[PDB]
């Protein structure tokens, strides 16, 4: 994971927003969307900012928040933080992660500045390393922080099971109706979607997930 001073921002475009793969998390609270309905409530594009911050700074990654890292390192979608004690707390001491301590001006939201220069006033280094250690506490334990940005990427379309020989209310890829589905001996050409009768009535359909031709008979009347 990149440092909080220079986070890794990954944009999402043309994606199937299935959040069930991700959802023990230290903290998980997203604003502007339903936590349990992330698939239905989608946006145009999503940007994921990945950074490593200490546990004591986990509360600073929020909209309207303040802190040493909130106002100078990462200013704020979703705020996902997870424990990384066994992953980032090196026995010899991990100093790969660096955090900014002083800045000329307050950082704009969703804005990051990467620099390695030393400020001259008498020399001060704006970026300081976070010394995560296995003997550190919960607040000083490393935690992987992912920040999502909310702005064409929606959840997968839901599907039900297939029922045959029973009067069902089917919906095959937008072809809706009511009837009794059964195995049909008709041989569709491999580019066709459904069939029609001499009176322009539907007589068959191809299952979008099984590629089988299902005869359709109306429910008895």
């Amino acid at each position, epitope marked *: 994971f990149a440092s909080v001073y220079a986070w890794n921002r990954t944009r999402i475009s043309n994606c199937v927003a299935d959040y069930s793969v991700l959802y023990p998390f230290f903290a998980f609270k997203c604003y502007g969307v339903s936590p349990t309905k992330l698939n239905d409530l989608c946006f145009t594009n999503v940007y994921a900012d990945s950074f490593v911050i200490k546990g004591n700074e986990v*509360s600073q990654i929020a909209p309207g928040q303040t802190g040493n890292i909130a106002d*100078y390192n990462y200013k704020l979608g979703c705020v996902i933080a997870w424990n990384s004690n066994k992953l980032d707390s090196k026995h010899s001491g991990n100093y790969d992660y660096w955090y900014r*301590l*002083f800045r*000329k001006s307050k950082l704009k939201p969703f804005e990051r500045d990467i620099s390695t220069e030393i*400020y001259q006033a*008498n020399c*001060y280094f704006p970026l300081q390393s976070y010394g995560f250690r296995p003997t550190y506490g919960v607040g000083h334990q490393p935690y992987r922080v992912v920040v999502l940005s909310f702005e064409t990427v929606c959840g997968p379309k839901k599907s039900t099971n297939l029922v045959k020989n029973k009067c069902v209310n089917f919906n095959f890829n937008g072809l809706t109706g009511t009837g009794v589905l059964t195995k049909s001996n008709k041989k569709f050409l491999p580019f066709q979607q459904f069939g029609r009768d001499i009176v322009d009535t539907t007589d068959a359909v191809r299952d979008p997930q099984t590629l089988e031709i299902l005869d359709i008979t109306p429910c008895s009347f």
Partner: antibody
Amino acid sequence: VQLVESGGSVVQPGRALRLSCAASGITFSSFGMYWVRQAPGKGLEWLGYIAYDGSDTYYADSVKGRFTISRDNSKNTLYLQMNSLRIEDTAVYYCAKDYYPLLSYYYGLDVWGQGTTVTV
Amino acid sequence: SVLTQPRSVSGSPGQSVTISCTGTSSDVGAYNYVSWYQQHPGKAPKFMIYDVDQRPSGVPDRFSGSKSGNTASLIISGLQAEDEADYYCSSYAGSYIWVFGGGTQLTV
């Protein structure tokens, strides 16, 4: 960067008194400034702070609307304009320099002045 | 909004004493920006401990401390006769405003 604070004097209550502290060198514009007061027989009380650029000004609620802190970027000097000073507003005023340069506000005071005593 | 601290803390050379200041969750229990300073009579306070568990350059390592919940404590080990001074703590009250404790006297 040594800080020399002067201007302390005895005045009648309700008068306006300005406390000015002078920095050493030309590093005053390179770091922030803060004001702290010390009443006799009590601890230290924070009065306010000033950003390195002199634009962002913050002060405590108890000193809101009465005490004004100003700094000179060219002369490396700062001022503390206290208005409507009361009888109980008698304390030693000292200036504190931020440990980190620019705008950090996440560090203690590195350099502290001698302190100017104000009585009423 | 000044964090309350004990009026005085006993001590002796060659031993260790703990000086603590207590506030509320608004400042002490919200931000980990606890700072401690050592003040001598007739002189301005000198910063010794900052950021809960950090010390500035030139300050002896004997001055340390820890914070838990809404209570901030400063622990001095191997105190000497010259270390007797009035210690005061600081915490970030938010909105770019800081507050200082009542002030605890350290004895020798």
